mmCIF file of C-alpha atoms in Angstrom:
data_model
loop_
_atom_site.group_PDB
_atom_site.id
_atom_site.type_symbol
_atom_site.label_atom_id
_atom_site.label_comp_id
_atom_site.label_asym_id
_atom_site.label_seq_id
_atom_site.Cartn_x
_atom_site.Cartn_y
_atom_site.Cartn_z
ATOM 1 C CA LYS C 1 -12.862 31.570 -2.845
ATOM 2 C CA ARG C 2 -9.132 31.587 -2.182
ATOM 3 C CA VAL C 3 -6.573 28.794 -2.097
ATOM 4 C CA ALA C 4 -2.959 28.966 -1.030
ATOM 5 C CA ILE C 5 -0.359 26.555 -2.313
ATOM 6 C CA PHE C 6 2.803 25.500 -0.466
ATOM 7 C CA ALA C 7 5.436 24.304 -2.917
ATOM 8 C CA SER C 8 9.135 24.177 -3.808
ATOM 9 C CA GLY C 9 11.497 23.099 -6.581
ATOM 10 C CA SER C 10 9.830 22.391 -9.878
ATOM 11 C CA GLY C 11 6.193 23.120 -8.938
ATOM 12 C CA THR C 12 4.606 20.780 -11.481
ATOM 13 C CA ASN C 13 1.741 19.982 -9.096
ATOM 14 C CA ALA C 14 1.167 23.697 -8.478
ATOM 15 C CA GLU C 15 1.124 24.127 -12.281
ATOM 16 C CA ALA C 16 -1.510 21.372 -12.750
ATOM 17 C CA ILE C 17 -3.738 22.976 -10.109
ATOM 18 C CA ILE C 18 -3.388 26.413 -11.787
ATOM 19 C CA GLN C 19 -4.127 24.753 -15.165
ATOM 20 C CA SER C 20 -7.223 23.124 -13.643
ATOM 21 C CA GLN C 21 -8.515 26.578 -12.580
ATOM 22 C CA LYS C 22 -7.860 27.818 -16.155
ATOM 23 C CA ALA C 23 -9.823 24.792 -17.473
ATOM 24 C CA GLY C 24 -12.873 25.701 -15.386
ATOM 25 C CA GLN C 25 -12.537 22.653 -13.126
ATOM 26 C CA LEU C 26 -11.187 24.144 -9.905
ATOM 27 C CA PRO C 27 -14.020 25.989 -8.115
ATOM 28 C CA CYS C 28 -11.613 28.456 -6.461
ATOM 29 C CA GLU C 29 -8.759 30.862 -7.214
ATOM 30 C CA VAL C 30 -5.066 30.324 -6.387
ATOM 31 C CA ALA C 31 -4.282 33.435 -4.370
ATOM 32 C CA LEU C 32 -0.892 32.829 -2.805
ATOM 33 C CA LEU C 33 2.196 30.678 -3.049
ATOM 34 C CA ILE C 34 4.257 30.054 0.083
ATOM 35 C CA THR C 35 7.728 28.754 -0.783
ATOM 36 C CA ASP C 36 11.266 28.435 0.653
ATOM 37 C CA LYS C 37 13.428 30.114 -2.036
ATOM 38 C CA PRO C 38 13.010 32.711 -4.855
ATOM 39 C CA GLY C 39 15.255 30.902 -7.354
ATOM 40 C CA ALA C 40 13.028 27.972 -8.323
ATOM 41 C CA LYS C 41 10.828 26.998 -11.255
ATOM 42 C CA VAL C 42 7.712 27.007 -9.028
ATOM 43 C CA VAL C 43 8.231 30.698 -8.269
ATOM 44 C CA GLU C 44 8.604 31.457 -12.005
ATOM 45 C CA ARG C 45 5.520 29.375 -12.888
ATOM 46 C CA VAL C 46 3.391 31.083 -10.290
ATOM 47 C CA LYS C 47 4.734 34.659 -10.749
ATOM 48 C CA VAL C 48 3.689 34.755 -14.435
ATOM 49 C CA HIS C 49 0.052 34.344 -13.312
ATOM 50 C CA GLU C 50 0.569 37.408 -11.081
ATOM 51 C CA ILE C 51 -0.136 35.292 -8.017
ATOM 52 C CA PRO C 52 1.503 36.732 -4.852
ATOM 53 C CA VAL C 53 4.485 34.753 -3.578
ATOM 54 C CA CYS C 54 5.928 34.796 -0.100
ATOM 55 C CA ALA C 55 9.358 33.178 0.051
ATOM 56 C CA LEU C 56 10.138 32.316 3.669
ATOM 57 C CA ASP C 57 13.286 30.370 4.416
ATOM 58 C CA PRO C 58 12.458 28.523 7.688
ATOM 59 C CA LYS C 59 16.089 28.695 8.958
ATOM 60 C CA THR C 60 15.875 32.534 9.045
ATOM 61 C CA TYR C 61 13.457 32.189 11.984
ATOM 62 C CA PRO C 62 14.431 31.346 15.635
ATOM 63 C CA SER C 63 11.993 28.408 15.809
ATOM 64 C CA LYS C 64 9.419 26.460 13.769
ATOM 65 C CA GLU C 65 6.752 28.372 15.736
ATOM 66 C CA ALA C 66 8.171 31.787 14.781
ATOM 67 C CA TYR C 67 8.280 30.759 11.109
ATOM 68 C CA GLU C 68 4.659 29.496 11.247
ATOM 69 C CA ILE C 69 3.466 32.707 12.937
ATOM 70 C CA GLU C 70 4.639 34.620 9.847
ATOM 71 C CA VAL C 71 3.112 31.937 7.551
ATOM 72 C CA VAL C 72 -0.321 32.337 9.249
ATOM 73 C CA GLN C 73 0.037 36.132 9.083
ATOM 74 C CA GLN C 74 0.448 35.850 5.291
ATOM 75 C CA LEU C 75 -2.507 33.467 4.873
ATOM 76 C CA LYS C 76 -4.812 35.739 6.906
ATOM 77 C CA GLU C 77 -3.651 38.826 4.951
ATOM 78 C CA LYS C 78 -4.545 37.130 1.647
ATOM 79 C CA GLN C 79 -7.950 35.939 3.019
ATOM 80 C CA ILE C 80 -7.087 32.271 2.346
ATOM 81 C CA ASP C 81 -9.937 29.763 2.754
ATOM 82 C CA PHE C 82 -8.064 26.538 1.901
ATOM 83 C CA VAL C 83 -4.435 25.385 1.982
ATOM 84 C CA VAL C 84 -2.968 22.892 -0.536
ATOM 85 C CA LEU C 85 0.441 21.385 0.146
ATOM 86 C CA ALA C 86 2.148 20.463 -3.116
ATOM 87 C CA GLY C 87 5.692 19.369 -2.310
ATOM 88 C CA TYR C 88 5.959 21.070 1.094
ATOM 89 C CA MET C 89 8.845 19.336 2.814
ATOM 90 C CA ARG C 90 8.292 20.353 6.450
ATOM 91 C CA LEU C 91 5.981 18.976 9.144
ATOM 92 C CA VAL C 92 2.962 21.200 9.833
ATOM 93 C CA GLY C 93 3.276 22.488 13.412
ATOM 94 C CA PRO C 94 0.661 23.404 16.045
ATOM 95 C CA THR C 95 0.538 27.094 15.049
ATOM 96 C CA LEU C 96 -0.247 26.416 11.380
ATOM 97 C CA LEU C 97 -2.631 23.553 12.206
ATOM 98 C CA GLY C 98 -4.423 25.548 14.900
ATOM 99 C CA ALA C 99 -5.206 28.368 12.488
ATOM 100 C CA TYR C 100 -6.149 26.164 9.523
ATOM 101 C CA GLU C 101 -7.372 22.830 11.035
ATOM 102 C CA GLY C 102 -9.680 21.028 8.624
ATOM 103 C CA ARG C 103 -8.597 23.278 5.732
ATOM 104 C CA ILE C 104 -5.160 21.822 4.829
ATOM 105 C CA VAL C 105 -4.621 18.939 2.379
ATOM 106 C CA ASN C 106 -1.507 17.223 1.145
ATOM 107 C CA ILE C 107 -0.317 14.871 -1.603
ATOM 108 C CA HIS C 108 2.176 12.079 -0.966
ATOM 109 C CA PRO C 109 3.767 9.696 -3.464
ATOM 110 C CA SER C 110 3.020 6.398 -1.648
ATOM 111 C CA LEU C 111 -0.092 4.508 -0.611
ATOM 112 C CA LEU C 112 -0.208 5.632 3.015
ATOM 113 C CA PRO C 113 0.288 4.282 5.645
ATOM 114 C CA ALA C 114 3.197 2.633 3.744
ATOM 115 C CA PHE C 115 6.342 4.741 3.191
ATOM 116 C CA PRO C 116 5.614 7.991 5.068
ATOM 117 C CA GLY C 117 8.189 10.815 5.039
ATOM 118 C CA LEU C 118 10.805 11.883 2.513
ATOM 119 C CA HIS C 119 11.697 10.183 -0.808
ATOM 120 C CA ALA C 120 8.783 7.716 -0.700
ATOM 121 C CA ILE C 121 9.211 6.681 -4.355
ATOM 122 C CA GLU C 122 12.822 5.719 -3.573
ATOM 123 C CA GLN C 123 11.582 3.957 -0.411
ATOM 124 C CA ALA C 124 9.202 1.797 -2.464
ATOM 125 C CA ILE C 125 11.953 0.906 -4.960
ATOM 126 C CA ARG C 126 14.382 0.000 -2.110
ATOM 127 C CA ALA C 127 11.701 -2.099 -0.385
ATOM 128 C CA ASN C 128 11.110 -3.979 -3.659
ATOM 129 C CA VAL C 129 7.319 -3.564 -3.610
ATOM 130 C CA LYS C 130 5.377 -4.328 -6.790
ATOM 131 C CA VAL C 131 2.603 -1.778 -6.222
ATOM 132 C CA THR C 132 2.892 1.746 -4.874
ATOM 133 C CA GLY C 133 0.816 4.834 -5.630
ATOM 134 C CA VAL C 134 -0.382 8.284 -4.579
ATOM 135 C CA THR C 135 -2.328 9.509 -1.524
ATOM 136 C CA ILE C 136 -4.203 12.754 -0.997
ATOM 137 C CA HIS C 137 -5.259 13.445 2.609
ATOM 138 C CA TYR C 138 -6.300 16.059 5.127
ATOM 139 C CA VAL C 139 -3.373 17.206 7.234
ATOM 140 C CA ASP C 140 -3.511 16.573 11.016
ATOM 141 C CA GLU C 141 -0.729 16.703 13.690
ATOM 142 C CA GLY C 142 1.685 13.959 12.539
ATOM 143 C CA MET C 143 3.852 13.087 9.518
ATOM 144 C CA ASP C 144 1.506 12.180 6.620
ATOM 145 C CA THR C 145 -1.354 11.520 9.030
ATOM 146 C CA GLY C 146 -4.941 12.650 8.622
ATOM 147 C CA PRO C 147 -8.113 11.355 6.924
ATOM 148 C CA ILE C 148 -7.333 9.940 3.470
ATOM 149 C CA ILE C 149 -9.382 11.557 0.667
ATOM 150 C CA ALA C 150 -8.154 9.610 -2.373
ATOM 151 C CA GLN C 151 -5.619 7.042 -3.397
ATOM 152 C CA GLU C 152 -4.525 5.547 -6.724
ATOM 153 C CA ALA C 153 -2.244 2.545 -7.242
ATOM 154 C CA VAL C 154 0.697 2.468 -9.664
ATOM 155 C CA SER C 155 2.394 -0.812 -10.581
ATOM 156 C CA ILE C 156 6.185 -1.024 -10.508
ATOM 157 C CA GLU C 157 7.115 -2.946 -13.640
ATOM 158 C CA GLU C 158 10.374 -4.895 -13.939
ATOM 159 C CA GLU C 159 11.804 -2.370 -16.420
ATOM 160 C CA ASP C 160 10.854 0.595 -14.187
ATOM 161 C CA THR C 161 13.632 2.726 -12.700
ATOM 162 C CA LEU C 162 13.391 5.545 -10.127
ATOM 163 C CA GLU C 163 13.129 7.970 -13.069
ATOM 164 C CA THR C 164 10.436 6.120 -15.056
ATOM 165 C CA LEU C 165 8.392 5.346 -11.923
ATOM 166 C CA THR C 166 8.668 8.992 -10.802
ATOM 167 C CA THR C 167 7.307 10.034 -14.230
ATOM 168 C CA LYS C 168 4.379 7.634 -13.850
ATOM 169 C CA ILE C 169 3.650 8.817 -10.296
ATOM 170 C CA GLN C 170 3.855 12.492 -11.273
ATOM 171 C CA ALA C 171 1.342 11.818 -14.126
ATOM 172 C CA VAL C 172 -1.088 10.386 -11.547
ATOM 173 C CA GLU C 173 -0.511 13.344 -9.218
ATOM 174 C CA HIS C 174 -1.113 15.957 -11.973
ATOM 175 C CA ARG C 175 -4.460 14.397 -12.856
ATOM 176 C CA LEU C 176 -5.520 13.227 -9.394
ATOM 177 C CA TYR C 177 -4.763 16.282 -7.229
ATOM 178 C CA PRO C 178 -6.928 18.702 -9.225
ATOM 179 C CA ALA C 179 -9.695 16.130 -9.834
ATOM 180 C CA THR C 180 -9.763 15.426 -6.104
ATOM 181 C CA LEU C 181 -9.771 19.146 -5.214
ATOM 182 C CA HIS C 182 -12.694 19.655 -7.658
ATOM 183 C CA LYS C 183 -14.744 16.907 -5.934
ATOM 184 C CA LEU C 184 -13.768 18.002 -2.414
ATOM 185 C CA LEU C 185 -14.454 21.698 -2.885
ATOM 186 C CA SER C 186 -17.571 21.219 -5.049
ATOM 187 C CA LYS C 187 -19.998 24.174 -5.353
ATOM 188 C CA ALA C 188 -22.814 21.842 -4.185
ATOM 189 C CA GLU C 189 -21.736 22.350 -0.568
ATOM 190 C CA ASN C 190 -20.837 25.908 0.432
ATOM 191 C CA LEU C 191 -18.580 24.298 3.043
ATOM 192 C CA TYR C 192 -15.155 26.016 2.963
ATOM 193 C CA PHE C 193 -16.082 29.325 1.294
ATOM 194 C CA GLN C 194 -18.923 30.631 3.507
ATOM 195 C CA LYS X 1 7.271 -32.251 -8.132
ATOM 196 C CA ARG X 2 5.519 -31.966 -4.789
ATOM 197 C CA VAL X 3 3.926 -29.047 -2.981
ATOM 198 C CA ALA X 4 2.554 -28.893 0.536
ATOM 199 C CA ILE X 5 -0.200 -26.469 1.481
ATOM 200 C CA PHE X 6 -0.655 -25.074 4.985
ATOM 201 C CA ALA X 7 -4.263 -23.992 5.475
ATOM 202 C CA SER X 8 -7.211 -23.749 7.890
ATOM 203 C CA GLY X 9 -10.865 -22.724 7.809
ATOM 204 C CA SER X 10 -12.653 -22.686 4.476
ATOM 205 C CA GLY X 11 -9.598 -23.467 2.343
ATOM 206 C CA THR X 12 -10.796 -21.519 -0.699
ATOM 207 C CA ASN X 13 -7.194 -20.640 -1.659
ATOM 208 C CA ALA X 14 -6.197 -24.284 -1.303
ATOM 209 C CA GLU X 15 -9.141 -25.170 -3.589
ATOM 210 C CA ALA X 16 -8.070 -22.629 -6.265
ATOM 211 C CA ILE X 17 -4.534 -24.079 -6.283
ATOM 212 C CA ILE X 18 -5.856 -27.657 -6.612
ATOM 213 C CA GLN X 19 -8.181 -26.414 -9.392
ATOM 214 C CA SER X 20 -5.243 -24.806 -11.199
ATOM 215 C CA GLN X 21 -3.409 -28.172 -11.084
ATOM 216 C CA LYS X 22 -6.558 -29.815 -12.517
ATOM 217 C CA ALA X 23 -6.624 -27.076 -15.210
ATOM 218 C CA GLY X 24 -3.075 -27.909 -16.318
ATOM 219 C CA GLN X 25 -1.633 -24.578 -15.144
ATOM 220 C CA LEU X 26 0.210 -25.634 -11.977
ATOM 221 C CA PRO X 27 3.442 -27.457 -12.933
ATOM 222 C CA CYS X 28 3.473 -29.523 -9.703
ATOM 223 C CA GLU X 29 1.161 -31.719 -7.609
ATOM 224 C CA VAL X 30 -0.371 -30.947 -4.201
ATOM 225 C CA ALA X 31 0.984 -33.765 -2.067
ATOM 226 C CA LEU X 32 0.141 -32.780 1.480
ATOM 227 C CA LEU X 33 -2.030 -30.473 3.538
ATOM 228 C CA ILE X 34 -0.868 -29.406 7.016
ATOM 229 C CA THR X 35 -3.747 -28.027 9.091
ATOM 230 C CA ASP X 36 -4.742 -27.402 12.742
ATOM 231 C CA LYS X 37 -8.312 -28.819 12.988
ATOM 232 C CA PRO X 38 -9.845 -31.970 11.399
ATOM 233 C CA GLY X 39 -13.375 -30.508 11.383
ATOM 234 C CA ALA X 40 -12.953 -27.828 8.709
ATOM 235 C CA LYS X 41 -13.975 -27.333 5.097
ATOM 236 C CA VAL X 42 -10.328 -27.248 3.946
ATOM 237 C CA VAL X 43 -9.831 -30.805 5.223
ATOM 238 C CA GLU X 44 -12.997 -31.950 3.401
ATOM 239 C CA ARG X 45 -11.919 -30.179 0.175
ATOM 240 C CA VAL X 46 -8.466 -31.705 0.226
ATOM 241 C CA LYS X 47 -9.434 -35.246 1.423
ATOM 242 C CA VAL X 48 -11.763 -35.820 -1.557
ATOM 243 C CA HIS X 49 -8.699 -35.492 -3.832
ATOM 244 C CA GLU X 50 -7.048 -38.215 -1.734
ATOM 245 C CA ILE X 51 -4.291 -35.813 -0.747
ATOM 246 C CA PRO X 52 -2.694 -36.769 2.617
ATOM 247 C CA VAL X 53 -3.748 -34.539 5.517
ATOM 248 C CA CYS X 54 -1.747 -33.953 8.667
ATOM 249 C CA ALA X 55 -3.768 -32.237 11.373
ATOM 250 C CA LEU X 56 -1.402 -30.928 14.047
ATOM 251 C CA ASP X 57 -2.816 -28.815 16.830
ATOM 252 C CA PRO X 58 0.176 -26.642 17.856
ATOM 253 C CA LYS X 59 -1.156 -26.074 21.416
ATOM 254 C CA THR X 60 -0.758 -29.820 22.113
ATOM 255 C CA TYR X 61 3.036 -29.436 21.846
ATOM 256 C CA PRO X 62 5.587 -28.374 24.539
ATOM 257 C CA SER X 63 6.915 -25.534 22.351
ATOM 258 C CA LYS X 64 6.642 -23.935 18.892
ATOM 259 C CA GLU X 65 9.948 -25.700 18.123
ATOM 260 C CA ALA X 66 8.546 -29.144 19.027
ATOM 261 C CA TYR X 67 5.487 -28.556 16.819
ATOM 262 C CA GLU X 68 7.694 -27.446 13.895
ATOM 263 C CA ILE X 69 9.973 -30.493 14.304
ATOM 264 C CA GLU X 70 6.918 -32.690 13.627
ATOM 265 C CA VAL X 71 5.886 -30.418 10.711
ATOM 266 C CA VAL X 72 9.346 -30.785 9.092
ATOM 267 C CA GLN X 73 9.208 -34.552 9.683
ATOM 268 C CA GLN X 74 5.915 -34.772 7.745
ATOM 269 C CA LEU X 75 7.259 -32.607 4.911
ATOM 270 C CA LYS X 76 10.393 -34.772 4.635
ATOM 271 C CA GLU X 77 8.222 -37.927 4.780
ATOM 272 C CA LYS X 78 6.136 -36.686 1.835
ATOM 273 C CA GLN X 79 9.200 -35.562 -0.231
ATOM 274 C CA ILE X 80 7.935 -31.962 -0.362
ATOM 275 C CA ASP X 81 9.827 -29.620 -2.727
ATOM 276 C CA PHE X 82 7.868 -26.391 -2.135
ATOM 277 C CA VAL X 83 5.650 -25.044 0.661
ATOM 278 C CA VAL X 84 2.590 -22.809 0.038
ATOM 279 C CA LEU X 85 1.004 -21.028 2.980
ATOM 280 C CA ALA X 86 -2.673 -20.378 2.305
ATOM 281 C CA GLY X 87 -4.258 -19.030 5.477
ATOM 282 C CA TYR X 88 -1.598 -20.264 7.905
ATOM 283 C CA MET X 89 -2.018 -17.994 10.896
ATOM 284 C CA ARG X 90 1.173 -18.771 12.843
ATOM 285 C CA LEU X 91 4.652 -17.265 12.508
ATOM 286 C CA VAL X 92 7.140 -19.540 10.745
ATOM 287 C CA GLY X 93 9.860 -20.345 13.297
ATOM 288 C CA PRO X 94 13.573 -21.148 12.860
ATOM 289 C CA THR X 95 13.138 -24.942 12.600
ATOM 290 C CA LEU X 96 10.652 -24.759 9.722
ATOM 291 C CA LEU X 97 12.543 -21.910 8.017
ATOM 292 C CA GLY X 98 15.915 -23.658 8.357
ATOM 293 C CA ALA X 99 14.609 -26.814 6.694
ATOM 294 C CA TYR X 100 12.738 -25.043 3.876
ATOM 295 C CA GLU X 101 14.428 -21.594 3.417
ATOM 296 C CA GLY X 102 13.811 -20.226 -0.064
ATOM 297 C CA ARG X 103 11.005 -22.747 -0.678
ATOM 298 C CA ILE X 104 8.147 -21.206 1.362
ATOM 299 C CA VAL X 105 5.706 -18.605 -0.016
ATOM 300 C CA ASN X 106 2.744 -16.886 1.567
ATOM 301 C CA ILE X 107 -0.301 -14.816 0.579
ATOM 302 C CA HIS X 108 -1.474 -11.821 2.619
ATOM 303 C CA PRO X 109 -4.554 -9.638 2.101
ATOM 304 C CA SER X 110 -2.889 -6.186 2.202
ATOM 305 C CA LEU X 111 -0.272 -4.377 0.149
ATOM 306 C CA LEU X 112 2.746 -5.104 2.348
ATOM 307 C CA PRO X 113 4.466 -3.437 4.149
ATOM 308 C CA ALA X 114 1.109 -1.844 5.130
ATOM 309 C CA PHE X 115 -1.093 -3.807 7.578
ATOM 310 C CA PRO X 116 1.032 -6.860 8.470
ATOM 311 C CA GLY X 117 -0.426 -9.519 10.795
ATOM 312 C CA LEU X 118 -3.945 -10.757 11.473
ATOM 313 C CA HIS X 119 -7.230 -9.362 10.057
ATOM 314 C CA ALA X 120 -5.519 -7.069 7.534
ATOM 315 C CA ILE X 121 -8.736 -6.448 5.571
ATOM 316 C CA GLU X 122 -10.379 -5.174 8.761
ATOM 317 C CA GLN X 123 -7.207 -3.159 9.474
ATOM 318 C CA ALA X 124 -7.508 -1.362 6.104
ATOM 319 C CA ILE X 125 -11.169 -0.559 6.663
ATOM 320 C CA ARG X 126 -10.447 0.723 10.202
ATOM 321 C CA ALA X 127 -7.599 2.874 8.849
ATOM 322 C CA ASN X 128 -9.941 4.326 6.206
ATOM 323 C CA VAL X 129 -7.589 3.713 3.274
ATOM 324 C CA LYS X 130 -8.994 3.970 -0.238
ATOM 325 C CA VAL X 131 -6.751 1.337 -1.818
ATOM 326 C CA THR X 132 -5.641 -1.973 -0.354
ATOM 327 C CA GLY X 133 -4.809 -5.258 -2.065
ATOM 328 C CA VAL X 134 -3.016 -8.620 -2.008
ATOM 329 C CA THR X 135 0.646 -9.601 -1.588
ATOM 330 C CA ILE X 136 2.397 -12.863 -2.426
ATOM 331 C CA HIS X 137 5.930 -13.170 -1.004
ATOM 332 C CA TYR X 138 8.723 -15.525 -0.049
ATOM 333 C CA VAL X 139 8.690 -16.270 3.666
ATOM 334 C CA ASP X 140 11.699 -15.147 5.741
ATOM 335 C CA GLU X 141 12.233 -14.712 9.469
ATOM 336 C CA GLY X 142 9.601 -12.344 10.838
ATOM 337 C CA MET X 143 5.927 -11.518 10.303
ATOM 338 C CA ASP X 144 4.945 -11.053 6.631
ATOM 339 C CA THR X 145 8.556 -10.299 5.676
ATOM 340 C CA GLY X 146 10.481 -11.679 2.711
ATOM 341 C CA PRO X 147 10.983 -10.770 -0.972
ATOM 342 C CA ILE X 148 7.677 -9.725 -2.548
ATOM 343 C CA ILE X 149 6.798 -11.760 -5.668
ATOM 344 C CA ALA X 150 3.522 -10.127 -6.735
ATOM 345 C CA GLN X 151 1.010 -7.541 -5.627
ATOM 346 C CA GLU X 152 -2.377 -6.415 -6.896
ATOM 347 C CA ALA X 153 -4.342 -3.370 -5.764
ATOM 348 C CA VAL X 154 -8.045 -3.381 -4.849
ATOM 349 C CA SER X 155 -10.009 -0.145 -4.449
ATOM 350 C CA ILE X 156 -12.263 0.292 -1.422
ATOM 351 C CA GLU X 157 -15.413 1.904 -2.772
ATOM 352 C CA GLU X 158 -17.723 4.010 -0.597
ATOM 353 C CA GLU X 159 -20.368 1.299 -0.596
ATOM 354 C CA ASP X 160 -17.879 -1.470 0.319
ATOM 355 C CA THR X 161 -18.259 -3.229 3.662
ATOM 356 C CA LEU X 162 -15.916 -5.753 5.336
ATOM 357 C CA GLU X 163 -17.965 -8.511 3.651
ATOM 358 C CA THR X 164 -17.989 -7.081 0.111
ATOM 359 C CA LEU X 165 -14.311 -6.078 0.239
ATOM 360 C CA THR X 166 -13.396 -9.542 1.557
ATOM 361 C CA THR X 167 -15.233 -11.054 -1.467
ATOM 362 C CA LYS X 168 -13.287 -8.791 -3.837
ATOM 363 C CA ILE X 169 -9.961 -9.585 -2.151
ATOM 364 C CA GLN X 170 -10.666 -13.345 -2.166
ATOM 365 C CA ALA X 171 -11.475 -13.126 -5.930
ATOM 366 C CA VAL X 172 -8.010 -11.571 -6.473
ATOM 367 C CA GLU X 173 -6.331 -14.221 -4.278
ATOM 368 C CA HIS X 174 -8.022 -17.150 -6.115
ATOM 369 C CA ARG X 175 -6.790 -15.867 -9.483
ATOM 370 C CA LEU X 176 -3.456 -14.391 -8.393
ATOM 371 C CA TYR X 177 -2.029 -17.117 -6.136
ATOM 372 C CA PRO X 178 -2.191 -19.850 -8.802
ATOM 373 C CA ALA X 179 -1.123 -17.505 -11.639
ATOM 374 C CA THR X 180 1.870 -16.417 -9.549
ATOM 375 C CA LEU X 181 2.780 -20.016 -8.588
ATOM 376 C CA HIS X 182 2.638 -20.958 -12.320
ATOM 377 C CA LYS X 183 5.066 -18.117 -13.210
ATOM 378 C CA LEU X 184 7.360 -18.716 -10.226
ATOM 379 C CA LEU X 185 7.599 -22.480 -10.622
ATOM 380 C CA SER X 186 7.800 -22.478 -14.458
ATOM 381 C CA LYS X 187 8.972 -25.710 -16.169
ATOM 382 C CA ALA X 188 11.622 -23.844 -18.214
ATOM 383 C CA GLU X 189 13.769 -23.089 -15.144
ATOM 384 C CA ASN X 190 13.158 -26.320 -13.148
ATOM 385 C CA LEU X 191 14.774 -24.579 -10.182
ATOM 386 C CA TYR X 192 12.956 -26.117 -7.200
ATOM 387 C CA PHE X 193 12.373 -29.637 -8.572
ATOM 388 C CA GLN X 194 15.917 -30.879 -9.295
ATOM 389 C CA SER X 195 16.796 -34.557 -8.766
#
């Protein structure tokens, strides 16, 4: 029962998922990290668990399709059953989606459909909303589109800044992503690991 | 200290605001209802408090501007200081906005900017979101635009239907609209009711 994670930068969501496996809550094993650069905390955090990492810079490839062909090659090689995006900053193209349709999920720091795309916490602050939150969803063709699995609201208090709100939102993500993955990939159904 | 309410249909939000006045929580008095149809529960609910009612069918006017000119006339006639939209289903045009800019608020049953416009509770169910909610905001030019004053989230449970979610959202509106109006229009500031 193998999961791949796509992540970059700090990798705190990837860490919470790995911690959830160690707790006995995730009903699968993290088997691969796909990332953009070697010199990042997420690589360090994952490497110490002896989980394979494939660091593919997308700009090295002639096209998005060529990059995704290599991505899919890696997922197939590691016998990946499910794909978890955890701070993956690119759109998922037709090659990746075609190979893993119905088996890719994502987390996004807004209540979709509000504030899709990059820097959604900053978007909510700039729009002066009073409530934002976190969305976990299946990945389909478009930007942050696909059937929504879970959402949780977070209030923006008057004293909140980008930093303090980001902390609150990350706390929700670290609890919610693994709890949602546990419920979704429950051993009751054999669904994704047949 | 006079407020006008714009409402149609059942008028349950209008009722909650009147009730909050009667409770001692609203620091102003409801002085006028502007509505579209005489034969509605909101008219009945408001009339029994002997609050003046102006029923203006907008379709019986040459233009949106002509209708709003009459609206503004009625508001000026009644010495209205603040305008509360409570199920007003038309866009606020330049005539109304020009006369009462900064003194019009609205309630909307989604977490703006998601699901602006009509039937937003149905929109959220059709979009299969798991969280929706309520927004109270100042009214500017445009549809459901303007500085957001308050929001409250409501979870859509698996067993929720349009009917049961609507009940939940209306419960939030009936508490939140008057509580927000109390905070916004607080006596300490006396911002909107200067002589």
